[PDB]
Design a protein. Structure first.
Length: 330
């Protein structure tokens, strides 16, 4: 089997991407944030505290003839940005772009933190990291990809995110019309449960390529590119007036600037992020200070190749017995 679904930016800055997902019988379609940095599929639901729902579409398990309470199971997750959610668990039929899994754990939120309530465009998350990170207790549950894997034509999914435009998540096949050149594959460590790999270096604008190993994760659920402070300083030094602002929480730059590109290495290959992809717009409405798309990972504990980096490439998440990642230009 295969599946193919379009993913759509939630706003004009590409702050996140949402993909429609069918849950239950008859189908209830919710728009989920596909997140290769976590492993829980959770949704706003009829069980979510009413004051914490503001415009999201909810899953109602009592209206699904295929829903079954997973008795005794609970879940609770906290993300790197301080947001969180928790609840109980149903199994139900879940379909993405024509690919159907029966018996998928659908984690129903009883509580969500303020940042989730305040984002009416995101109805929940669909985790695509390794199932070892799934938070369901006492019986850990598998991700949608893990459940689908054996049925897929090939044990892979691909992320093809757009810049200021929709893109595609495919399951079970590699669309050879969706990229240019060849796909360069690179080793993955699953020891932390992430799609963790090592970039071979970077360049700023037209500058010379610096060969240096940069360990990090491919995380579709993170908006920006988070890299070591040395690398990030070298980038922003090329932008007149750019500076790190403690009050804003990262590098800002004059909105009048033209940003340089940033290149990262994948083995001997190179992925070029155009400068415009690094512009996240005014820090507040009407400001002439703009927020940068490349930020330091120093306070995080891991480097994160988020959407800023991934959207410059066609990315293969190869879930074979030894997982690997593939990157192509497009
Ligand atoms: O609550 C948790 C459980 N352990 C991890 C799961 C994936 C997201 C990061 C972290 N947060
Ligand atoms: O596990 C993850 C990857 N996806 C994102 C969700 C929102 C907060 C940042 C990040 N945490």
């Amino acid at each position: 089997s295969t599946g193919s679904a379009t993913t759509t930016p939630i706003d004009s800055l590409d702050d996140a991407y949402i993909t429609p997902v069918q849950i239950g019988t008859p189908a209830q379609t919710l728009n989920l944030d596909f997140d290769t940095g976590s492993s829980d599929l959770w949704v706003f639901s009829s069980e979510t505290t009413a004051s914490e729902v503001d415009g999201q579409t909810i899953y109602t398990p009592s209206k699904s003839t295929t829903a079954k309470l997973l008795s005794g199971a609970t879940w609770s997750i906290s993300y790197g940005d301080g947001s969180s959610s928790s609840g109980d668990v149903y199994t139900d039929t879940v379909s993405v772009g024509g690919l159907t899994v029966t018996g998928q754990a659908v984690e129903s939120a009883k509580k969500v933190s303020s940042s989730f309530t305040e984002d009416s465009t995101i109805d929940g998350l669909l985790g695509l990291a390794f199932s070892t990170l799934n938070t369901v207790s006492p019986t850990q549950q598998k991700t949608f990809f893990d459940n689908a894997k054996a049925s897929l034509d090939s044990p892979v999914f691909t992320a093809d995110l757009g810049y200021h435009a929709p893109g595609t998540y495919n399951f079970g096949f590699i669309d050879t019309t969706a990229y240019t050149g060849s796909i360069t594959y690179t080793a993955v460590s699953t020891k932390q449960g992430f799609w963790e790999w090592t970039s071979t270096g970077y360049a700023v604008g037209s500058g010379t390529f610096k060969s240096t190993s940069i360990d990090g994760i491919a995380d579709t659920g993170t908006t920006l590119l988070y890299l070591p402070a040395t690398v990030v300083s070298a980038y922003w030094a090329q932008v007149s007036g750019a500076k790190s602002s403690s009050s804003v929480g990262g590098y800002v730059f004059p909105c009048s600037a033209t940003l340089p590109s940033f290149t990262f290495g994948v083995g001997s290959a190179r992925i070029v992020i155009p400068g415009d992809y690094i512009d996240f717009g005014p820090i507040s409405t009407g400001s002439s200070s703009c927020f940068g798309g490349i930020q330091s990972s120093a306070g995080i504990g891991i480097n994160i190749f988020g959407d800023v980096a991934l959207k410059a490439a066609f990315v293969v998440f190869n879930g074979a017995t030894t997982p690997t990642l593939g990157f192509a230009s497009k």
